[PDB]
Amino acid sequence: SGAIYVGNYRVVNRHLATHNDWANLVWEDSSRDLLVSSTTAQGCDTIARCDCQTGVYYCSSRRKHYPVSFSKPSLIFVEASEYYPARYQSHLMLAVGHSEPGDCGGILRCQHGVVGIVSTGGNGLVGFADVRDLLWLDE
Numbered sequence: 001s002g003a004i005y006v007g008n009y010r011v012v013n014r015h016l017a018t019h020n021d022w023a024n025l026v027w028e029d030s031s032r033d034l035l036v037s038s039t040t041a042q043g044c045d046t047i048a049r050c051d052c053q054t055g056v057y058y059c060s061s062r063r064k065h066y067p068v069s070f071s072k073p074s075l076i077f078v079e080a081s082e083y084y085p086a087r088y089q090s091h092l093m094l095a096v097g098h099s100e101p102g103d104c105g106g107i108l109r110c111q112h113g114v115v116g117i118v119s120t121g122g123n124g125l126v127g128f129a130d131v132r133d134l135l136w137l138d139e
């Protein structure tokens with residue numbers, strides 16, 4: 001679990017969005033596993049606007065942060081799950097690091113701000129949904 005809170009927006013994994021997220025929907029994209037809902041309170045987070053390929057993510061299944069080298073946002077095949085059919089997920093970045101399904105929502109950060117959230121993983125990999133291209137999150 002986990003979310004990004006920036007301005008009057010809450011960014012979560014689309015497959016973990018709540019009834020309240022859908023009732024306050026701003027934007028969603030199944031191909032990216034992202035959903036953004038509106039909030040009444042002002043957020044605590046800053047979004048990175050950069051091309052970093054190194055950063056630190058929070059892993060809830062270890063209660064620890066780990067440093068990672070990650071690939072640029074890309075289209076990657078993701079096997080079927082209870083949430084989605086087998087499909088290509090776009091704007092996904094892969095790295096070597098521990099992750100389990102409940103780690104989705106953990107934040108990846110570089111020195112500039114939030115980069116993205118855990119969205120895929122397994123077998124010693126961890127995949128992050130990028131949010132740095134969503135310029136409207138700042139306005």
Ligand SMILES: NC(=O)[C@H]1CCCN(C(=O)[C@H]2CCSc3ccccc32)C1
Nearest residue numbers: 033078081083099100101119120121122
């Ligand atoms: N974005 C998706 O389509 C997700 C939906 C939930 C399931 N997905 C995973 O990749 C699982 C694989 C087992 S291990 C694992 C560790 C971390 C995170 C997620 C997973 C795909």
Ligand SMILES: [Zn+2]
Nearest residue numbers: 050052110112
């Ligand atoms: Zn950066």
